[PDB]
Amino acid sequence: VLSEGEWQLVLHVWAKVEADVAGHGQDILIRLFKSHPETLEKFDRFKHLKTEAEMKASEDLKKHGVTVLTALGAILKKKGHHEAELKPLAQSHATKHKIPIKYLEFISEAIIHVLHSRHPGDFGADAQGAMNKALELFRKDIAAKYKELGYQG
């Protein structure tokens, strides 16, 4: 479980992410798609995007960054008591979208990367470790739901 101090470091930098959810969402989805191209295949709606320039110019992809970051934000603010927020997400990413857990690791590493570039002063190693611990909790609670549904993997 994160400490209260750890949750504080997480929510403090998240409050900065919220000053521009759109730009963050963009960078994060683009970094995911460049680093792990197999991830982009899972979206019929973004599959036609071939370059970074194309991805940067797509209003829809930017609309979907907002969506994803808003969902994650609602979960972060619960500081671990995220049962009702996490249940729908896992059911859908397992049974409808077909997203292995590993990809959830990839997107985590992208989020950490982008938070670092954009918020150095608020994202030292101590905030880094705290954010990692939160995104592990996330992915740990999701995996247990996947396992329930028979999709562990």
The residue from 34, 42, 116, 145 that contacts ligand HEM (CB under 6 A) is 42
Query: Residue 24: left if φ>0, alpha if ψ -120 to 50, beta else—which one?
Result: alpha
The answer to the question of whether 81 is labelled as a binding residue is no
Asked whether 73 and 18 are in contact (CB, 8 A), the reply is yes
Residue 67 interacting with ligand HEM (CB under 6 A): yes
Residues 102, 118: Cα–Cα separation, whole Å: 25
CB 104, min distance to ligand HEM, A: 5
Q: For the segment 68-87, give every residue that binds ligand HEM (CB under 6 A).
A: 68, 71-72
Range list of H helices, 47-153: 52-56, 59-76, 83-95, 101-118, 125-149
The answer to the question of whether 93 is labelled as a binding residue is yes
Q: By CB under 6 A, which span of 11-19, 47-55, 89-97, 114-122 interacts with ligand HEM?
A: 89-97
Residue 104 interacting with ligand HEM (CB under 6 A): yes
Asked whether 31 and 63 are in contact (CB, 8 A), the reply is no
Interface contacts to ligand HEM, rule CB under 6 A: 39, 42-43, 45, 67-68, 71-72, 89, 92-93, 97, 99, 103-104, 107
